[PDB]
Structure formats: structure tokens, C-alpha cells
């Protein structure tokens, strides 16, 4: 079978044996795999996450496929499934996997397929334990690779909202930092969230005309240009935000969100920045956190329950939105195009097979 | 009646009319009032919190008293009560008070008796609406002024634990930053907490011999000298902490706690520092928060439910502890002694009357 990978030393096509499902696993024929920032990181230089003893890493962690061999599992041929990303590390299972919370496992206690220590999903076929395969409605198969990123936000919201559960919290405004695939998906999710947000805002740093600015305004949200208005200045210009969702990977934002939050608000952090120091007014951060009962919660990955919730959220998203968000689905024959990234490309995917 | 106050321009005795209870209020005869850091701040220069049109501020927010006139409330003569601290601002009630969550009210939407905008409890008598008077067991009357500070921690724990409620969290280690009255009370509370902590730690910066170090070690906790081991170095020397409770008011601690927290841990911030900037590695803060699913939650004040929970916690605290924590209860005749603060004085109170 063909797979798209990065060899130790740009993405290329590689040939490898079709895997065979061990007991408890099913054989899945890949349909479409989304391309994400992490995939670009790898194609960049992030060759650390390579599997032990391997000279290549098959890419892709956002996938959807069809079950071709149920083997001894309770799945059925033809079921449309989306795989979870985390798997037990080389040293075997542990408490996080035992108790079914691998998304809470710390560094070194897991592998993430297509990201660290284990091959991804950009291959014609792949296998996975039945417990990590989530059945989704057949009609979501075409954009099924979007279930995983929607999963990410379902988890982040669950933890952020749980932090405000000891009192009567009724938010009205939400602010998403970042106009990438995750931030835009999240803005649309907040538009339909049961918390009933009235005013939505999204931070970016693009000049018009720009398709991300267009999606933001079509969702009826307010586009905030960080070059004109820093996060901490937002309350002066617009309003204090009950809920902030950080998806930029810019450290200043994690600190400054505290000044933009309304009293009793919570900020969910999803960005993954590298070390970077700078002068911060920590007394202001510290005091606002305390005197205004605020919270900052970090979240990474997600698990089965979030993928299931994602299928419901998916049906509520505007159809025009899903069309404008996915800028290109490319056949394997033209896979390289899926990795060209410019301001006008938002979410791309590679199509391996159909039906 | 006599009251202890600070006049615009050290604490002194002042004479004022005994108040009369309006409808819905009871008249309380003060028994004992604890002295706290805020009281010292006022005696320092914090004369901003003075009541409008008043040239003095009666001190004290940690009090216990006996009901002498139930007026038209459902309280009974002789009931032992502890008052809550927050009251509606001059501009009348608002949603926070309407819904019974004044502890969540933002700046400017409340007064705190003895702290900002309203007179405290260091007077022979005081009144208060029945809804803000919490009945406590008669036998807790002698150290009843401790219910309010215990209240503070009951609320902070409730919010911090609520932030970890979306997954199976089972902490084993807890770290209290600060060896003041609030930190020491909190360390004893964690010793008996239902979460079953196995290893307790407390941060201070005192040289032996010191009575705060003695309380820490008698509770079977480990004393950590911040001059020898900074918060961020703690995991190297001892272990990562599942739960951190910050009660130092030192901004570096709020930032550094993130590096000391174990994966999936939460830090509760209670300190109130002034503005102070400095170089921080925000990328390290940001990334650890996200990749290890951590949370930081701020908390201030507390309300009725927490004062009620405090009465149960009080009975579980070691008797030797309560004896060592309260370094002096001084009769009104010698009130000034209650404000002398040195390393060997931990918690003091002023006794206005008995029984
Ligand atoms: N914790 C998790 O589970 C998880 C999962 C997926 C992704 N993430 C992280 O989430 C972040 C967002 O990922 P994505 O897939 O949406 O990433 P992305 O495609 O890189 O998008 C980030 C977006 O934020 C914008 N941005 C960066 N700095 C900005 C600034 N100072 N002001 C305004 N906009 C700014 C970028 O704008 P320009 O294009 O104009 O530079 C870009 O559009 C990344 O850090 C990623 O690592 C975390
Ligand atoms: N949010 C709320 O509702 C609330 C309620 C009450 C109090 N607070 C705040 O909570 C904090 C603690 O108050 P308290 O009544 O316990 O205050 P406190 O009596 O001032 O005690 C703070 C303690 O922390 C220690 N400390 C300060 N910096 C330190 C450092 N770098 N390393 C080690 N120890 C350090 C001090 O040690 P030394 O004596 O050796 O300097 C002191 O013993 C204050 O900031 C107060 O404003 C908040």
C-alpha cells in the first residue's frame, strides 16, 4: 500500500505492506485525512517524534475511513469510523489508558499517531483497536476528518465550563484568539453552543480582503485585528469577555487574556508555544485572577466521548461554513497540493478512496 | 458604645451610638474579633476603603457574637452567630446579591465591612440582616472568629476541585505557599480533606527556631524554605504537586506554581499583590498549562454555604493546632497588643465580651 510520509532528513510517497489486524482490532480503508499544523511542523524539522527504529513517519492524525475487516470486533463491514489519536506507549498500558482517560496522560506516557512515536493515518489502510474507533453517521463521511478537531474543542469546553460550575455562571460574550482552522471551527461551535453567547469576537492579524475575515463576519462575529487592538486593550474598545479560547500559540495571549476576561470568566488555552521570556506585569495578572474569581484552564487532545459529542455539533454547523472552511480536498495523485499553505488556504485534506 | 477604628490621618478607641436593628436585622453583642493582614493594611495607609462621608473606619471582618435582640427575624436571643463580610453597595442591591452570590460580585458592586466602604465589627454591638448571620455551635464561640478565614478556604477548594471535575482526579500531594494564618489554617484543613492527601508541604522563609515551622512539622508536613528552594525547583527536590494553594501575595509564585504542579493539577490563588512586572518565561508557562491539562483558579471572599461547611471542618481540626495557632486573645482594655506583629505572633483576636 501507499502512504505519505517524511523520511529522516518534504512529504513523499512511500510503499509498505498492508497491515493485518491483531485480535481486538479492525482493518480500516482510509477515505480522507486532514492536513494540520503539526503535519507542517514535521515536514519542517520536527523529526523527533519518529517511531523508534524507524527511518520515516507516516503523517496525519485527522482521519475518517470505512471498516473493511471487522475481524473479531463488534464493528460491521462498511461502518464509517474516525480513529482517536493516542495509543499506549512502547512500555505498555498505564493508568490513563486503563481508566479510559488517555487524553489526560502526561508527556512520555503515550504516543500520538502521526505526531509522536507512532505512524499516522495517511496510508491506504490502517488498523486500530475497536475501543479507539468511533462510528459516525455515514453522511458525515465526506468531512469526517473534521470530527477530530471538533473533538479538541468539545473537551476544552467541557473542562472550562466545569471550572465555572460551583456558581451560577451565565456568559454573554466569547472571544476566540486565532483565525486558523481550530479557531474558526471553534467560533462556529460557540455560535451554536447551549450557553447562548450573544456577542462573538475573533482575533487575527490579516489585511482585507481575506477569506478568514469573511468567515468571521458571515458568522456574525466581530473581527479584531491584533495589530490595531492588543488583547489587553479589547475591553476598552469592545467589552470584557466572559469566555476566551486561545488558539494562537502566542504566549503573550495566555497572559493578556486575564486582563480581557470579564469578572468570573474563564480562559481555555489550547496553543502550544516554545520557550520565550519577556517582561510581564505578574502582579496585575495575579491580582485580577484573584479579586475577580477568574480561571485559566489548559486542554490537549480528546477522547471518545468528545468525538461522539462532535458528531452532534457537526450537524448544527452552517453548511455554507463547512464549504468555506475546507479550501481543498486533493486526490492522492495530487497530494503535494494539500501541503501548500498561504493566507487563502484554510483547511485541506487528502482523499485516498471514496464511498 | 466603644469601637476600635482608624481615623483619617494607628488604631484608637472611639465612642459611638449603639446601632438599632432595622426590619430584617438583628442586634448582636460582639464577643471576639480576629485581627488580620487587611486590618494592618488599613492601620498602614490603606485609608481609601473609608465609608463615604465618614472620617473613620471601624476595623475587623472576622467576628463572632451573640444575638441580643432578634427583632423581627427568625433568630433567637442567645444564638451564637458569625457575620458574612459583603454587603450591597450604596447604590443598592444587584444581581450578585439578588441571586445570593455576593462573593462573586466584581469590584465596585459591594462593600466589605471592616475593609471597604463600610464599618467593621470591632465595636461592642453591631447589626446585620438575618440572611448574613450564620448560626454556629455554641461551643465554637471562643474561636468563632476563625470561621470566616476557614470560609475563605472552603470556597477556594470548592472552585479548584470543580475545575478538575470533568475527569477522574485523585491527588496525593498538596503544597501550601505561605506560613501566615490563612496558609497554616489551610494546611490543617488539607490534612483532614476528603481527597486524602498523603504528602503535605508548606512554603515559608523563616529561620529556626520559629513557631510557624513547628506547627508545620507537627502537622506532619514538610517545611520548604523558599530561600533554599524556589517554587519552580520543588519538583526536583521533593515532587510535583497535585494541588497548590497560594497564600503569599507574591506574584512570582502565581507564575511559578505552574512548573511545580503535577500533570492535571490545579493551583488556587488567594494572594492579593500590587502591580509588579518582571521577566517571565511565558512560553514555558503557556505550554505546561496546555500539554499537561493544568488549571489556575482565583478565589476571593466566601458566602453562607462556606461558613456552614467551615463549622464541620472546625470540629475535625486538631485541638493542639487551634491552641498553637491563636497566639493571643486580648481584652478590649489591652486591645493595642492585638496589633503588634512579629515572627512569633500568628493569630490574635480582641475580646469585647464573654458568654
Ligand atoms: N492542545 C491541543 O490539543 C491542540 C490541538 C490542535 C492545535 N493546537 C494548537 O492550537 C494553535 C492553533 O492551531 P491551528 O490548527 O488553528 O493553527 P494555525 O493554523 O497556526 O493557526 C493559528 C492562527 O493564529 C494566528 N495568529 C498567531 N499569532 C497571532 C497574533 N499575534 N495575532 C493574531 N493572530 C495570530 C495565525 O495568523 P497568521 O496566519 O496571520 O500568522 C493563524 O491564523 C497552535 O498553537 C496549535 O499548536 C492545540
Ligand atoms: N482572596 C481572599 O479572599 C483572601 C482572604 C484573606 C487573605 N488573602 C491574602 O492571602 C495572603 C496571605 O494572608 P495571611 O492572612 O495568611 O497573610 P500574611 O499573614 O501576610 O502571611 C503571608 C505569609 O507568606 C509569607 N511569604 C511572603 N512572601 C514569601 C516568600 N517569597 N517566600 C516564603 N514565604 C513568603 C510571609 O512570610 P514572612 O512573614 O516571613 O514575610 C507570611 O508568613 C495575603 O496576600 C492576603 O492579602 C486573600
From Swiss-Prot, chains A, B:
NADP(+) binds at residues 179-182, 205-206, 226, 270-272, 299-301. CDD domains: glucose_DH (cd08230). GO terms for biological process: non-phosphorylated glucose catabolic process. It comes from the Archaea. Activated by molar concentrations of KCl or NaCl. Inhibited by EDTA in vitro. GO terms for molecular function: D-glucose binding; glucose 1-dehydrogenase (NAD+) activity; glucose 1-dehydrogenase (NADP+) activity; glucose 1-dehydrogenase [NAD(P)+] activity; identical protein binding; NAD+ binding; NADP+ binding; protein homodimerization activity. Substrate binds at residues 38, 47, 112, 148, 301. It is an enzyme of class 1 (oxidoreductase). InterPro entries: ADH-like_N (IPR013154), Glc_1-DH_arc (IPR026583), Glu_dehyd_C (IPR031640), GroES-like_sf (IPR011032), NAD(P)-bd_dom_sf (IPR036291). Changing residue 342 to K: Does not affect the kinetic parameters and has no effect on the salt activity profile. Its EC number is 1.1.1.47. Induction: Up-regulated by glucose. Binds 2 Zn(2+) ions per subunit. One of the zinc atoms is essential for catalytic activity while the other has a structural function, according to Ref.4. However, the crystal structures show a single zinc ion, the catalytic one. Its cofactor is Zn(2+). It catalyses: D-glucose + NAD(+) = D-glucono-1,5-lactone + NADH + H(+); D-glucose + NADP(+) = D-glucono-1,5-lactone + NADPH + H(+). Keywords: Carbohydrate metabolism, Metal-binding, NAD, NADP, Nucleotide-binding, Oxidoreductase, Zinc. Zn(2+) binds at residues 36, 61-62, 148. Homodimer. The reaction follows an ordered Bi-Bi kinetic mechanism, involving an ordered binding of NADP(+) and D-glucose, followed by an ordered released of gluconolactone and NADPH. Belongs to the zinc-containing alcohol dehydrogenase family. Glucose 1-dehydrogenase subfamily. Catalyzes the NAD(P)(+)-dependent oxidation of D-glucose to D-gluconate. Displays broad substrate specificity since it is able to catalyze the oxidation of a number of alternative aldose sugars, such as D-xylose, D-galactose, and D-fucose, to the corresponding glyconate. Can utilize both NAD(+) and NADP(+) as electron acceptor, with a preference for NADP(+). Physiologically, seems to be involved in the degradation of glucose through a modified Entner-Doudoroff pathway. This is Glucose 1-dehydrogenase. It comes from Haloferax mediterranei (strain ATCC 33500 / DSM 1411 / JCM 8866 / NBRC 14739 / NCIMB 2177 / R-4) (Halobacterium mediterranei).
